[PDB]
Amino acid sequence: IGTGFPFDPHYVEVLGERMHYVDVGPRDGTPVLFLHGNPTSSYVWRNIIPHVAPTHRCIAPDLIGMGKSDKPDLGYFFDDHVRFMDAFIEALGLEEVVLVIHDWGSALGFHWAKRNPERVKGIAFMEFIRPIPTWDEWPEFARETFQAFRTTDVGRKLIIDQNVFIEGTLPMGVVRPLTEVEMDHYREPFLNPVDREPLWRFPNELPIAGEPANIVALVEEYMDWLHQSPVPKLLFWGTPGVLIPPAEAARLAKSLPNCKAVDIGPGLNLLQEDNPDLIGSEIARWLSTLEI
Template sequence: MQMQDGNEKEALSAEFSFEKQRIKVLDGEMAYIDTGGSGSTTAVFLHGNPTSSYLWRNVIPHVAPQARCLAPDLIGMGDSSKLKGSDYRFFDHARYLEAFLDAVVTTGKILLVLHDWGSALGLDWACRHEERVAGLALMEFIAPVPTWNDFPQEGREIFQAFRHPLKGRELLIEHNVFIEQILQAGVSRTLSSVEMDHYRAPFLKVEDREPLYRFPNELPIAHEPADVYARAERYHDWLMANELPKLYFWASPGGLIPEEKAAWYVRTLRNTESVALGAGKHFVQEDNPHLIGQEIAKWVQARWKA
């Protein structure tokens, strides 16, 4: 395991220095970062809830010299289209992501860099397209949770409240709790006003917050929702069995994946290198982006550019 040297901390930038492109995807448009570059491997960075490609702003600059880097905004999030009448279910996101990858990465292998719901969508895609996958970089990823007692205690009560048909919508739609409370709670440092405004921007209108409601209600917990849980079991079984190269980042105390569960993944995942990020909760890219980017860059250099 590799630990971060506390004397080598780099400044964290709130600035978003990338120019986004847009592409027609099904009946909407998806915005994305594309650093360009040559080579047979493309690194695709997938965010989750309630973030966007902005989450990767301090990570991608480390990796871009080694590989073409793509970072889409999931449909309904970031600068991607808002869909009228959509429930933004996991399966809707999966269709848009598949169409996006078909359109933008037409050849070569894909290195998936995955976090939160980006991990669920990326692993679901990967287990159905293993021949296209070069490797998997994972952090705070979504796995099926057999019972609510297996869900981290710190977030259990509020995430159960999100499932209430009335209270959940009040919290997530009317009060925008995922942006205003959950996001900061998942970061060890205090996010600046500039950073918070970047994350708020796609959801200033109440009518645009449906994805923020749907994602917590899609988490595969206690076998519900049954269709999402089944899909998560499938990709998780595949993840634990395959021999693809993996780079697994974990933090202390962690968020979705507490330290003791992270230790189990370190022991159990096959063909895996692990990196201990030090202090971090769920949104580890906001606490330790440079270490994440540096380690991915070294991994790409060693495995695909040697």
């Protein structure tokens, strides 16, 4: 699996801040918008995009506060990311899009899709945000960790002072061992502890056991939208997963209309790091079946 990131940097001013993004592939045609989550960046797409860019434009932004994007003094609530992603999509003048989304990137993509349904030609998604009704539906191995994350005192000392979301959660989200070069790429935006606020606010926003109820409600709404939408859907899943265990992937593959599900083999959260070749080639094949 490749550790390089060859893409030329592109930047765009969004709401007064500079955001970075990858932009490759043909300039014509429907673009494919790749949205990463916590605590990654466009780096998480580096081995997927080269499968897609020969036939379709690939756009991969770094979320505000993340990757090579600027670091405004925000709370980095989900609502902050929604505002910046909305403004990024409009700054690039995108019209219709295909989404490829993961983790908090999927909460962004699904929520944008619900509000802009005529502009979404397909959604590929993996290890995505859905409501977790009780802590029992969270993986046992990860339960005490995430309960501690979701506190002001203990959670900030773990995530901000000790950088535990980068040095622990991230490699614990990949089945294979991440290399030192790959870790350094994920570390780069967060070398300064003051810049780690998004790493801590994100898990405090996760819709688990009914809280925070505003996120639970927003996620419920876009899942209800997704269940009733004819949009083409491509779901990647792994064993044992984290957000989407295999029994949930099986349930969704039946319940979501127009859905193809792909078993990538072993995986936790960052499926892209365990089987990028299958995810990228399967996306390129799925795209070639779409009306775009």
